[PDB]
Amino acid sequence: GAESLTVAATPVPHAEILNVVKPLLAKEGVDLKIKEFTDYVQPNVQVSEKRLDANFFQHQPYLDEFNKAKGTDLVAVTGVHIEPLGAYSSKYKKLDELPSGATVVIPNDATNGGRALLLLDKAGVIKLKDNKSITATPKDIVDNPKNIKIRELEAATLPRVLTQVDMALINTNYALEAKLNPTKDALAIEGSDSPYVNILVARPDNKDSDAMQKLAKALHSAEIKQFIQEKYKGAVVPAF
Numbered sequence: 001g002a003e004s005l006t007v008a009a010t011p012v013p014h015a016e017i018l019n020v021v022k023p024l025l026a027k028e029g030v031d032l033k034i035k036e037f038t039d040y041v042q043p044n045v046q047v048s049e050k051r052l053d054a055n056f057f058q059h060q061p062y063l064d065e066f067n068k069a070k071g072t073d074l075v076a077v078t079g080v081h082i083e084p085l086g087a088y089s090s091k092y093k094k095l096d097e098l099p100s101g102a103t104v105v106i107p108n109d110a111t112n113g114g115r116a117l118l119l120l121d122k123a124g125v126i127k128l129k130d131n132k133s134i135t136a137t138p139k140d141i142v143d144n145p146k147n148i149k150i151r152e153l154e155a156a157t158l159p160r161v162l163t164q165v166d167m168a169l170i171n172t173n174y175a176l177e178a179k180l181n182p183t184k185d186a187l188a189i190e191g192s193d194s195p196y197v198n199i200l201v202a203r204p205d206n207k208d209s210d211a212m213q214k215l216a217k218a219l220h221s222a223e224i225k226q227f228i229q230e231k232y233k234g235a236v237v238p239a240f
C-alpha cells in the first residue's frame with residue numbers, strides 16, 4: 001500500500017503546486033496529504049510537534065532564524081521556487097512620487113524585514129550601512145533623505161493595510177492571494193537570483209525517507225516547472 005506523507009503549506013503557490021504533484025506521487029506509492037495554513041508559524045510548529053511530516057512555505061533564512069528562536073531542528077530537503085518580493089502602493093505609481101515622510105510598511109520578522117530593507121536599498125529609497133547582512137534592521141539605515149517612516153507589521157497583514165500606507169513590501173504568497181500582480185503592479189522588485197528560494201522542510205528522521213525523496217524529486221520535475229511557469233507567469237520562478 002501507499003506511504004503516507006503529510007505536508008503543511010501556504011495556499012498560493014505552495015498548496016497549488018502540491019495539488020499538481022500529488023497524482024505523480026500516487027503513481028510512485030506515496031499518498032500526499034496537504035494541509036493548508038495561512039501563517040508563517042504553525043507550519044513549523046506542526047512539524048516540530050510531530051503532527052505533520054513536512055512543510056512547504058518558507059525560505060532558508062526564515063527557517064534558520066525560526067530554529068534559532070524556537071530551539072528546533074527542522075531541516076531543509078530541497079529548493080523549489082523563488083517569489084521575488086515586490087513593493088506595492090495603492091496611492092503612487094512610481095517610487096519618485098513617494099512624499100517626504102512616506103509610510104512604508106515591511107514585515108516585522110527578522111529575515112523578511114531585512115529582505116524588504118535590502119529591496120528599498122536596491123531601489124534607492126534608503127541606503128543601508130556598507131557591512132549590512134540580510135537581517136538588517138531600520139537601525140542600519142545610513143541615508144534617508146525623504147524621511148521615510150519604516151513601519152513593521154506581521155507579513156500576512158500587509159495586504160489589508162495597503163490602502164492605509166504609502167507603500168507596502170509584501171511577500172508574494174500573500175500578494176498573489178490578495179490578487180496583486182507583482183510583474184505589473186510592483187514599484188520595485190527583487191531579482192530572482194536571491195537568498196530566498198522556498199524549500200521543502202522536514203525533520204532529521206524523515207528527510208532521507210523514501211517518500212520524502214520522491215516528493216523532493218517530483219518538485220524538480222519538468223511537469224512542476226511547466227505548471228509554475230504557466231500558472232504564475234513570472235511571479236513565481238522555478239529554482240531548478
Ligand code: MET
Binds near residue numbers: 171
Ligand atoms: C516564511 S519566509 C517567506 C515565504 C514567502 N513564500 C516568500 O518567499 O517570500
Ligand SMILES: [Cl-]
Binds near residue numbers: 047072073
Ligand atoms: Cl524540531
